[PDB]
Design a binder for this molecule. Structure first.
Ligand SMILES: Nc1ncnc2c1ncn2[C@@H]1O[C@H](COP(=O)(O)OP(=O)(O)O)[C@@H](O)[C@H]1O
Ligand SMILES: [Mg+2]
Lengths: 57, 418, 471, 239, 116
């Protein structure tokens, strides 16, 4: 009955265990927040292309 | 599945795995999904404590733990000289080509000895129908111009009658070279064999060492000489010359082979050995030949996994012993044994054991004494009769430069040259 | 090329478990219970009741229990309302060539009022040990300008050589001078400086920032600033965020990196604090028994590697408690590092700068970086003879302290003259004076000319013929 | 006689209930009437047999110290057989002139000892009333001992030495030259136990017994530095 | 001095040869005694095999052995491994074994005996 804040959440869910002490914030906003950080190198490669000075990985 | 327990606890180098019924003490296991090598050091019901010889970062509770059923062992055969290993007998050069990286990948399994090289095997004095015991030289391969006859020894604790023996020719390590029947069960032997690193290799007889180990240093040769088959320690603070004495002895000593163990020491010290030894030549064989042709390196840098330091030491001595079984005079250089003691101390601390002097485990002195007892002049186990020797030269790094260090106090109690 | 397309799999969302199951807080450490498949070295985000997010590192895992060290401290954390989110990864730093010319917190957060590092990669800050077979032995000599270093403690590019100093000595000035004047003796450009500060007072940070800014090297310097009033445990990751950056610049971008790690003694203090929270068996003078390995994982992140035209030259700065070189911090540092520059309080009091005492100093890579085709052929003999005569002069001064000047031999009086001239001419240098190694080896021979050629017993006869009378 | 009670067969319980192995110690869980200080035989999965001493008992639990080490021991296929006695050594006067392990096993290629008795290695404290006060001086031959630190026959006097010092040579000289100042009317028998010594230390002592003809009068118990450590806790009591 | 030392070495070699011969003779006597004892035990083993092959004389012995082992175990339920020759003989005597264990242990009769 504790519905998500619509101003901050556009979709998705927040799942939790019975005791309500372990949660997973699987919301579209949270997923996008994650993707914005783990996917940053890929985004930079897509936008500005390969770097010129980097020779090894 | 039956051989698979699960990780229960991880703390530094120490992993406690559950559902490990059937594991033996000091048995080799593969921890995690990358198969990190480790040894069981404590059994408690179904839970086994394991010291992992690799980095444990990223290991999760529930990860698989395989029981290999074997102890930690080295592969012994042609392909040991000119090679550098990492402590658990992994070729660092190979690791570099396969990984194609400047690091050592976690849980990388690569053969100790090169299975692609073809060695020119020539049979020995033994022929089909003869009786062959452990340590008998039943062949010889040409490894390099310096080790011109690498003698193929029947593994110790093996016996029977030679059912089949290969002819002279070029063989890879995996190709069968001998077949010996003992009790109707025929055993197949190749150019190499495995030996556990924690059990010293047998000899026929340990002899008194009486020939000098000429290190090339005036002060050491004249005032405090070592003998071939003797045990030496070099305690000193940092910047005293423990690594330069060790390397000078490796370069110029009269030993037929060198096993240099860079135990918990600078990677740069291993880089300079690899760079310099190919450019230094010896006359022991009668012609100028790089000393790298008769040296093996076992490197566990200070920032490599700590629990592997012990392994490296036990690897080095074993290799040394192996070459002593061939009638060679080997010097094994342990630089430094204080780092092995510190690794034991760290594992003991992670185990919550009662500390001995300066935090070290109460069993450190016994371990050092047992390790130093593996040096000596000896008559090889098998036939034809041949005499070898292993001289252990160990650098000691007392904390603060104080020779009251427990490691220094144990070593000076063990060794014969100070 | 398409190598960077391997960055793919970065487009992946991994939902994270939030745990409102903290059980206890013991200083730097927080215990979490009922964790699902805890991961050993994982990094977790603790959201406090007031909304601030701290980071912690899982130090131990046992079944469903996980012990986490919180870098920013555990003050304000409560067992009842603090939440912990498990990221499923180890601590990583975002790396790009744009980190140069930026200033970051001790935990990596930019403090330039600039943007977040637009990561070209995410590198695990613990790194990996370099394969000893993949290393190159450093043999390219860096001319630091200081004659006490370039003639006698010759530093090679890729060397890890700390500065052993004390509370009040001018080690910051010496380090700044080295950063200002370092370069190859035989060049064939500039060093990229990675500066990590652990627990330094505001004055040190201001000094180093001003010195880099004046010298014009800030445009290629990346600063990680943990201050004396910043979180103590954070200092455990400051030298790893810096070195991980250096390893990126040096080995993946082909730069030559000079790494300054100021006050490794504060890093050792933080390590001791964490050890004390852990209830561990303390080592000598209370530091953890594993401090050697922990320091090795920092210092051993330097050198050169095969097939890559970059390098990392470390210069840790290490305050010796009570000026005692046998203290665990300097003692262990000297067993791990390839030499040490010893800043002496006795020379500092005597007005000499740089107060470098050459006798306790060492460069383990000098024997290979100096010589015929690399510096000049007199170098190694001239440094050995200087060391011998300096030690003899110290002995003669001690002898004079007892028996007076009148009783000294002729050789002892020559050694006293050498001592005063060596300390007040060759050792003494301007804070902005740079001397070529050929200028410093011409100053060395003038000191060695105080003695008859037959008293220079450590200089080979061929070198003493060619350079003694030279004039 | 008393030896006649030896004609008795006492079957032994073989347990296979090992529950822990940490260092020297093996914990065994479901013993039936565990007995303190009792000697047990552990058969390993490999099949080799080792000996252990029960260091503590608690209900059905026993803690055993394995003299030869716990390497290779597992909780599944390792069995432990309880002998029911303490550690007894076989003793004959034919022991003189022989060499044994630190555990008392012959290493001179001779046969086992044809016992005249099995004597508990812990002995029994001597009645202080049954003791005689030693007063017969032994000429060690060494002036530093005879004239200023004179040893009486029956005395317990160690040699406090350190490493790199000739304490083996001094002890060999004492054994070589020892005798009464005023002979009563014979050479000492010698019992030499070595714990964690080098191979050349044992060789020195053995060959110096060779040279002086005192080896026929000697039993050696050689636990060298390459032998099990815990076996050193029984070597001095067997000797 | 070298001559004196080397003559001392020769004398010690002579003495050591004498001592080694004496020691080998002593060990020869001891080994002969051991071999005599081993022969006695081998004859005893052959006799034990012979007695075990006599079924009528072997049955009471087998019952006594089983009951003794059960009394040492004091377990409600037991397993008995025996030669395949004796499985049939043991099956005919399980009730006797159970009752004898019950009486000799002054305890309720053994619940169950498996024959492996
Ligand atoms: N025998 C020697 N001859 C010449 N220089 C030496 C010698 N021993 C040491 N050095 C010099 O001192 C440095 C420190 O010696 P090192 O072997 O690293 O000692 P340690 O292992 O005790 O730290 C060497 O790198 C070298 O520059
Ligand atoms: Mg060293």
């Amino acid at each position: 009955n504790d519905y998500l804040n619509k101003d901050l959440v556009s979709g998705g869910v927040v799942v939790s265990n019975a005791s309500d002490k372990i949660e997973i914030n699987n919301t579209l906003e949270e997923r996008l927040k994650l993707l914005s950080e783990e996917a940053l190198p890929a985004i930079r490669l897509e936008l500005y292309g390969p770097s010129k000075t980097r020779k090894f990985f | 599945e039956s051989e698979y327990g699960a990780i229960y606890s991880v703390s530094g180098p120490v992993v406690i795995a559950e559902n490990m019924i059937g594991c033996a003490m000091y048995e080799l296991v593969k921890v995690g999904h990358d198969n990190l090598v480790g040894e069981v050091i404590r059994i408690d019901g179904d839970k086994a404590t394991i010291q992992v010889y690799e980095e444990t970062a990223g290991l999760t509770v529930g990860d698989p733990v395989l029981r290999t059923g074997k102890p930690l062992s080295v592969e012994l055969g042609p392909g040991l000289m000119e090679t550098i290993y990492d402590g658990i007998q992994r070729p660092l050069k190979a690791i570099k080509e396969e990984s194609q990286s400047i690091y050592i990948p976690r849980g990388i399994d690569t053969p100790a000895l090169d299975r692609t090289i073809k060695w020119q095997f020539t049979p020995g004095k033994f022929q089909v129908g003869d009786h062959i015991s452990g340590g008998d030289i039943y062949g010889s391969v040409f490894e390099n111009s310096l080790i011109s006859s690498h003698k193929i020894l029947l593994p110790p604790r093996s016996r029977g009658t030679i059912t089949w023996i290969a002819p002279a020719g070029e063989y890879t390590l995996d190709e069968k070279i001998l077949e010996v029947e003992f009790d109707g069960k025929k055993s197949d032997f190749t150019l190499y064999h495995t030996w556990p690193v924690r059990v010293p290799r047998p000899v026929t007889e340990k002899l008194s060492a009486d020939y000098p180990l000429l290190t090339g240093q005036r002060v050491l040769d004249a005032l405090f000489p070592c003998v071939q088959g003797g045990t030496t320690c070099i305690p000193g603070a940092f910047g005293c010359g423990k690594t330069v004495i060790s390397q000078s002895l490796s370069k110029y000593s009269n030993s037929d082979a060198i096993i240099y163990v860079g135990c918990g020491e600078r990677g740069n010290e291993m880089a300079e050995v690899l760079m310099e030894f190919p450019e230094l030549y010896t006359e022991m064989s009668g012609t100028k030949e790089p000393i790298m042709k008769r040296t093996t390196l076992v490197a566990n840098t200070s920032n490599m996994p700590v629990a592997a330091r012990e392994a490296s030491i036990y690897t080095g001595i074993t290799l040394a012993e192996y070459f002593r079984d061939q009638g060679k005079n080997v010097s094994m250089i342990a630089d430094s044994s204080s780092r092995w003691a510190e690794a034991l101390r760290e594992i003991s601390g992670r185990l919550g054991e009662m500390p001995a002097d300066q935090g070290f485990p109460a069993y450190l002195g016994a371990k050092l004494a047992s390790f130093y007892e593996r040096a000596g002049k000896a008559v090889a186990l098998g036939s034809p009769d041949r005499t070898g020797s292993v001289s252990i030269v160990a650098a000691v790094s007392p904390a603060g430069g104080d020779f009251s260090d427990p490691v220094t106090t144990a070593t000076l109690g063990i060794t014969q040259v100070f | 090329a398409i190598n960077k397309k391997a960055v793919e799999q970065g487009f992946n969302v991994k939902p994270r478990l939030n745990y409102n199951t903290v059980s206890g807080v013991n200083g730097p450490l927080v215990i979490l219970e009922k964790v699902k498949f805890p991961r050993y070295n994982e990094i977790v985000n603790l959201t406090l009741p007031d909304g601030t997010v701290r980071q912690g590192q899982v130090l131990e895992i046992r079944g469903d229990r996980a012990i986490v060290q919180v870098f920013e401290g555990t003050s304000g954390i409560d067992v009842k309302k603090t939440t912990v989110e498990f990221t499923g990864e180890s601590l990583r730093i975002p790396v790009s060539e744009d980190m140069l010319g930026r200033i970051f917190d001790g935990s990596g957060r930019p403090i330039d009022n600039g943007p977040k590092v637009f990561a070209e990669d995410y590198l695990d800050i613990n790194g990996s040990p370099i394969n000893p077979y993949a290393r190159i032995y450093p043999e390219e000599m860096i001319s630091t300008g200081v004659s006490a270093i370039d003639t006698m403690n010759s530093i090679a590019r890729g060397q890890k050589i700390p500065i052993f100093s004390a509370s009040g000595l001018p080690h910051n000035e010496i380090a700044a001078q080295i950063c200002r004047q370092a370069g190859l003796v035989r060049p064939t450009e500039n060093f990229s400086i990675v500066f990590a500060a652990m627990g330094v007072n505001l004055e040190t940070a201001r000094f180093f920032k001003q010195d880099f800014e004046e010298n014009g090297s800030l445009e290629r310097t990346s600063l990680f600033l943990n201050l004396a009033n910043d979180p103590t445990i954070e200092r455990i990751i400051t030298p790893r965020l810096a070195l991980t950056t250096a390893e990126y610049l040096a080995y993946q971008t082909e730069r030559h990196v000079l790494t300054i790690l100021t006050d490794m003694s504060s890093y050792a203090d933080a390590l001791r604090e964490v050890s004390a929270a852990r209830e561990e068996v303390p080592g000598r003078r209370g530091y953890p028994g594993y401090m050697y390995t922990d320091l090795s994982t920092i210092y051993e992140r330097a050198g050169r590697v095969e097939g890559r035209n970059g390098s990392i030259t470390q210069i840790p700065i290490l305050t010796m408690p009570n000026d005692d070189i046998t203290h665990p911090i300097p003692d262990l540092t000297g067993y791990i590092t390839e030499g040490q520059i010893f800043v002496d309080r006795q020379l500092h009091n005597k007005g000499i700068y740089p107060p470098i005492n050459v006798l306790p100093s060492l460069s383990r890579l000098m024997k290979s970086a100096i010589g015929e085709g690399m510096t000049r052929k007199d170098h190694g003999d001239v440094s050995n003879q200087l060391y011998a005569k300096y030690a003899i002069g110290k002995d003669a001064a001690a002898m004079k302290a007892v028996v007076g000047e009148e009783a000294l031999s002729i050789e002892d009086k020559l050694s006293l003259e050498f001592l005063e001239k060596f300390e007040k001419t060759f050792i003494t240098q301007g804070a902005y004076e740079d001397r070529t190694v050929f200028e410093s080896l011409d100053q060395a021979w003038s000191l060695l000319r105080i003695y008859p050629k037959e008293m220079l017993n450590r200089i080979s006869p061929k070198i003493l013929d060619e350079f003694y009378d030279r004039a | 006689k008393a030896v006649e009670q030896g004609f008795n067969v006492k079957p032994r319980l073989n347990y296979n209930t090992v529950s822990g192995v940490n260092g020297p110690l093996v914990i065994l869980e479901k013993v039936k009437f565990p007995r303190y200080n009792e000697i047990v035989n552990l058969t390993l999965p490999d099949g080799t047999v080792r000996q252990g001493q029960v260091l503590e008992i608690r209900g059905d639990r026993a803690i055993v110290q394995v003299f030869e080490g716990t390497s290779g021991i597992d909780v599944k296929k390792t069995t432990v057989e309880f002998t029911g006695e303490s550690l007894r050594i076989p003793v004959s006067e034919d022991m003189l002139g022989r060499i044994f392990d630190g555990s008392g096993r012959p290493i001179d290629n001779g046969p086992k000892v044809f016992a005249e008795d099995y004597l508990d290695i812990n002995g029994s404290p001597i009645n202080p009333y049954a003791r005689i006060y030693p007063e017969e001086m032994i000429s060690t031959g060494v002036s530093a001992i005879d004239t200023m630190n004179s040893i009486a026959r029956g005395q317990k006097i160690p040699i406090f030495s350190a490493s790199g010092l000739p304490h083996n040579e001094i002890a060999a000289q004492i054994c070589r030259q020892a005798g009464l100042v005023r002979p009563t009317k014979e050479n000492f028998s010698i019992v030499f136990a070595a714990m964690g010594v080098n191979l050349e230390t044992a060789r020195f002592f053995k060959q110096d017994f060779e040279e002086n003809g005192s080896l026929e009068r000697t039993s050696l118990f050689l636990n060298l530095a390459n032998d099990p450590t815990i076996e050193r806790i029984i070597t001095p009591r067997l000797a | 001095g070298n001559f004196k030392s080397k003559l001392k070495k020769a004398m010690l070699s002579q003495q050591i040869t004498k001592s080694t011969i004496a020691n080998k003779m002593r060990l020869k006597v001891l080994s002969a005694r051991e071999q005599s004892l081993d022969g006695i035990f081998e004859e005893t083993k052959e006799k034990l095999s012979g007695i075990a092959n006599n079924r009528d004389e072997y049955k009471p012995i087998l019952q006594s052995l089983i009951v003794e082992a059960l009394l040492k175990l004091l377990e409600p339920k037991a397993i008995v491994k025996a030669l395949e020759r004796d499985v049939d003989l043991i099956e005919s005597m399980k009730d006797d074994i159970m009752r004898e264990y019950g009486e000799k242990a002054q305890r309720a009769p053994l619940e169950e005996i498996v024959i492996s």
